[PDB]
């Protein structure tokens, strides 16, 4: 480990920073690790560059249970990550027939895991029970609502946690490249047959050589190399509203509130800011782009970066749905002004499992992407398994789920309600 050189492409991001962290913990020599990201860690265009994220339980795919438990343990006990986890719990709510059904079935799925999750997860069938966990609601507001309360979760101070990894990496003497000298252009090969990767070249022409390369470029991964449409990148949206300390006080330590027909909000941070998201299948930004491995040009959804273009917001349609979420959850704040309107990018696989594997042809080159919009929670632990993969030690439960799988389904729809619409058809964000 001490004599192996690793390049982590996108190391200023969620899966990338986690990987560089666990390389250091595993005893890799800091000077042998090179983080290449367009932006310095925490990357300003990273999906994890956010006031907060939700930490919650999900049992959709096979490794999800173990990954979640693994992450929880670390969010609660790892001194590096512990300050950034706010265990206020989460309550999912609904008042529709289909919505309440989904809540009940979800609850039952937790039980069917058979590990005792009913001890920290509760079905709330009455108004009183809902108001008890979320005193800021009014009784009239929640008429007909049912709730599912998960006591294990809460929210995460996202950018702060990635910055915490970054501080450590830099203290340790990890090598960095940012800007054009940090922006992956193509991999380097020993022979023209392309079967042995020996490094990467960035868009400025700078070459970096290493034993192994990890591609953790999030929503950009599919643009940089050909993933054969395994990964379709999509934008989700959020707005902010600012509360006074007096307005914020009713929401202190209140659970994350979610409703699948509206979206979610998180309690005001130390500055009185509430972030609100809607729920929708996402937006693509289609372009032709020549990834490598294609390397002919190919239509791929390419992120329109808010970091490189701060004057971008979100479509008009998103303004509507975000305001509906605010009316649903926070009607007393309907006249609050929305601001820091922005788009946040992820990349979906067909089955919403990760794409974490060695490239089929380019040995030495490893993919660590396919976050599918639900992987910030895995910040503390995902790097441990990326390292296991590098070392040939990744267990089958993860390896099989994360394997190279082109043609395994339509990633444009993925596991969501619909194929994503494209930003070219949604006016207002420019
Ligand atoms: C968008 C979004 C996502 C999200 C969320 C809400 C929104 C609005 N809420 C979540 C939640 O409540 N709970 C949760 O678990 N996840 C939530 N998410 C998803 C989460 O943000 C993403 O799953 C995760 O952050 C993605 O990580 P990933 O590592 O995959 O992506 P990234 O963090 O963006 O990192 C990518 C890095 O790559 C760098 N980059 C890009 N191009 C290059 C090149 N060419 N060379 C080098 N680096 C490159 C980017 O800069 C970035 O740093």
| H, E, C per residue of the chain | CCCCCEEEECCCCHHHHHHHHHHHHCCCCHHHEEEECCCCCCCCCCCCCCCCEEECCCCCCCCHHHHHHHHHHHHHHCCCCHHHEECCCEEEEECCHHHHHHHHHHHHHHHHCCCCHHHCEEEECCHHHHHHHCCCCCCCCCCCCEEEEECCCEEECHHHHHHHHHHHHHHHCCEEECHHHHCEEEEEECCCCCCEEEEEEECCCCEEECCEEEECCHHHHHHHECCCCCCEEEEEEEEEEECCHHHHHHHCCCCEEEECCCEEECCCCCCCEEEEEECCCCEECEEEECCECCCCCEEEECCCCCCCCCCCCCCHHHHHHHHHHHHHHCHHHCCCCCEEEEEEEEEECCCCCCEEEECCCCECEEEEECCCCCCHHHCCCHHHHHHHHHCCCCCHHHHHHHCCCCCCCCCCCCCCCCCCEEHHHCCCCC
Ligand 1 centroid distance, CA of 220 (Å): 9
The reported resolution of this PDB entry, expressed in Å, is: 1.9
Ligand 1 touching residue 177 (CB < 6 A): no
Please give the method by which this entry was determined. Answer: X-ray
Best mutation site among 42, 44, 46, 47 for ligand 1, i.e. most ligand atoms within 8 A of its Cβ? Answer: 47
Ligand 1 centroid distance, CA of 37 (Å): 12
Ligand 1 touching residue 15 (CB < 6 A): yes
Ligand 1 touching residue 238 (CB < 6 A): yes
Best mutation site among 12, 17, 42, 48 for ligand 1, i.e. most ligand atoms within 8 A of its Cβ? Answer: 48
Residues in the chain: 430
Q: What is the CA radius of gyration of the chain?
A: 21
Strands 256-259 and 263-265: antiparallel
List, in order, residues 6 or more apart from 300 with CB less than 8 Å away: 222, 223, 229, 232, 233, 286, 287, 288, 289, 291
Ligand 1 touching residue 374 (CB < 6 A): yes
Protein residue closest via CA to atom 13 of ligand 1 = 54
Which structural domains are found in the chain, ordered by start? 1-86+153-231+350-409 (3.50.50.60), 87-152+232-349+410-430 (3.30.9.10)
Ligand 1 touching residue 37 (CB < 6 A): yes
* Residue environment code for 181-212, b if the CB has 16+ CB neighbours within 10 A, otherwise e: ebbbebbbbeeeebeebbbbebeeeeebebeb
Ligand 1 centroid distance, CA of 402 (Å): 17
Ligand 1 touching residue 262 (CB < 6 A): no
Ligand 1 centroid distance, CA of 16 (Å): 9
Ligand 1 touching residue 53 (CB < 6 A): yes
Ligand 1 centroid distance, CA of 42 (Å): 11
Ligand 1 touching residue 20 (CB < 6 A): no
Rounded CA gap, 207 and 226, in Å? 20
Best mutation site among 10, 36, 185 for ligand 1, i.e. most ligand atoms within 8 A of its Cβ? Answer: 10
Sign of dihedral through CA atoms 282, 368, 223, 220?
positive
Protein residue closest via CA to atom 17 of ligand 1 = 374
Ligand 1 centroid distance, CA of 78 (Å): 22
Ligand 1 touching residue 199 (CB < 6 A): no
Answer yes or no: are the C-beta atoms of 147 and 123 closer than 8 Å: yes
Rounded CA gap, 40 and 45, in Å? 10
Ligand 1 touching residue 371 (CB < 6 A): yes
């Amino acid at each position: 480990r001490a004599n192996t050189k690793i390049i982590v492409v996108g190391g200023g991001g969620t899966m990338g920073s986690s990987t560089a962290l666990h390389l250091l913990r595993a005893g890799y020599t800091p000077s042998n690790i090179t983080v290449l990201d367009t932006y310095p860690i925490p990357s300003a265009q990273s999906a994890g560059y956010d006031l907060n994220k939700i930490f919650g339980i999900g049992l959709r795919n096979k490794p999800d249970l173990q990954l979640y438990l693994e992450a929880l343990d670390m969010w609660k006990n790892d001194p590096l990550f512990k300050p950034f986890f706010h265990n206020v719990g989460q309550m999912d709510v609904s008042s529709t027939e289909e919505g309440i059904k989904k809540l009940r079935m979800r609850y039952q799925s937790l039980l069917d895991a058979g590990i005792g999750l009913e001890k920290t997860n509760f079905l709330l069938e009455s108004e009183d029970e809902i108001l008890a966990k979320a005193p800021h609601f009014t009784r009239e507001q929640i008429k007909g609502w049912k709730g599912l309360f998960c006591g294990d979760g809460g929210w995460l101070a996202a950018a702060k946690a990635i910055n915490a990894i970054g501080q450590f990496l830099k203290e340790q003497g990890v090598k960095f490249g940012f800007g054009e000298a940090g922006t992956f252009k193509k991999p380097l090969f020993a022979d023209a047959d392309e079967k042995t990767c020996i490094g990467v070249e960035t868009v400025d022409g700078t070459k970096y050589y290493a034993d192994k390369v990890v591609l953790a470029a999030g929503a950009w991964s599919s643009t940089l190399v050909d993933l054969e449409e395994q990964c379709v990148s999509k934008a989700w949206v959020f707005a902010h509203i600012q509360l006074t300390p007096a307005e914020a006080a009713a929401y202190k330590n209140t659970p994350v509130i979610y409703d699948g027909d509206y979206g979610f909000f998180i309690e005001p941070d130390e500055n009185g800011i509430i972030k609100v998201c809607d729920e929708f299948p996402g937006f693509t930004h289609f372009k032709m782009h020549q990834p490598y491995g294609s390397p002919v040009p190919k239509l791929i959804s390419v992120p329109r970066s808010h970091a490189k273009h701060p004057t971008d917001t979100y479509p008009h349609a998103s303004e509507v749905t975000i305001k509906k979420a605010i009316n649903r959850f926070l009607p007393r704040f309907n006249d609050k002004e929305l601001f820091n309107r922005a788009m946040c990018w992820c990349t979906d696989t067909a089955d919403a499992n990760l794409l974490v594997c060695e490239h089929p042809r380019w040995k030495g080159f490893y993919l660590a992407t396919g976050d599918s919009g639900h992987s910030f929670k895995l910040l503390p632990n995902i790097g441990k398994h990326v390292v296991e993969l590098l070392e040939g030690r990744l267990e089958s439960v993860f390896k099989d789920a994360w394997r190279w799988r082109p043609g395994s389904g339509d990633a444009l729809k993925s596991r969501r309600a619909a194929p994503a619409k494209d930003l070219a058809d949604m006016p207002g964000w420019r």
